[PDB]
Design a protein around this ligand. Sequence first.
Ligand SMILES: O=c1ccc2nc3ccc(O)cc3oc-2c1
Ligand SMILES: [Cl-]
Length: 331
Amino acid sequence: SGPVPSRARVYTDVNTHRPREYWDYESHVVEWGNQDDYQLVRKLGRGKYSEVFEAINITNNEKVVVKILKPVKKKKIKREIKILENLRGGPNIITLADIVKDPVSRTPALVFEHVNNTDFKQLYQTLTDYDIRFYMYEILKALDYCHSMGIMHRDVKPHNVMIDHEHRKLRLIDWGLAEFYHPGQEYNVRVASRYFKGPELLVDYQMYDYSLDMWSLGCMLASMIFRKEPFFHGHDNYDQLVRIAKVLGTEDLYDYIDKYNIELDPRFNDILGRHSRKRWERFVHSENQHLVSPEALDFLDKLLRYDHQSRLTAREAMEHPYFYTVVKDQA
Ligand SMILES: O=c1ccc2nc3ccc(O)cc3oc-2c1
Ligand SMILES: [Cl-]
C-alpha cells in the first residue's frame, strides 16, 4: 500500500515562501579566502568528515577554529555552507567566520569563531538540576530558530554542543548533516548518531521533519537526569530500536507502524517481541534523585514518542513548566 505521508505541525511551508537562492544550495557560489591569512596552532580533535584545528588570524591576531573538510560531494559542502550563512547570527548558533581552501589537500575548510572548547559530555558529571534546565533551554533557542528557518539539524548530540560554562554561553555546532525542510520530501534515514536516531530512522520512514531533532534532545535529557550516557545503548540500528522498545513499550511501536503504514523489516519481528511501557520512576536511583522531578519526567515523556507528530515542538518545549524557573531569571 505504501507509507502514509506526513507533514510538520510547525514551520511547514517556510522555505516555499522564501526565494530559490535560500534553499537551492546547489546553485550557491562560494567566495574563497586564502589560508595564508590563517596559521594552524594545534589540533582540537579528529572526525569522520573533517579535522578540526585551533588557528590564529594573522591580520588581527584573533583566535579562530578551522574545520578542514574531508572529501565529500560538492553539494553537501555547499549545503553546510549555505545553512551556516542562513543561520548566521541566530541564537546559540555557531558562526561561520570565513570560507577558505587549503593549500595542501586543496579541500575547503570552514573557519568559525573561537568558542571555549568544552564539550557537553565532560560537563555532564558536574551539572546541577538548574544548569541542566538552563542549557536545555539554550539548545531549545537554537533549535527553534533553525526550525523556523526551515532547517533540520539531523545530528543533535552532546558532542555537538559547545558550552562556555564560565560565561554560560552555548553553541550548537556541526551542521554538516543539516538539511532544509520541504513538505513531501523523503530524506535519507542514515543520519545522526546511533544512540540518538529517532524511531522513524530505525524503521526507515523517510518523510520526517524537525521532530527528529526533538527525539535526539530527549535522548540527551534522559542521559543527563538519569545519569546514564547513553540512555538507549544499542549495538546496531536494529538493536537500538529494541532498547527503545524495552522502555517505551512495543504497544505504541506497532501502533506507530500501523498509523503510517510502515513496511517493517522482517528482522525486527524476531527481536522486538512484546514489552511494557516502563515508568520513569524505575530509572531513578540515589545518585540522580536531585536531577529528577515531576516536571522533568513530564517534559521528557513528551519528547520521547514513536509518533514524531506527537513530540513537542521546539517552541512548545520552551513553554513547559520544566523551564519556568529558568525563564523567570532571564527576565
Ligand atoms: O570552538 C570550536 C571547536 C570545535 C568546533 N567544531 C565544529 C564542527 C562543525 C561546525 O560546523 C562547527 C564547529 O565549530 C567548532 C568550534
Ligand atoms: Cl513500571
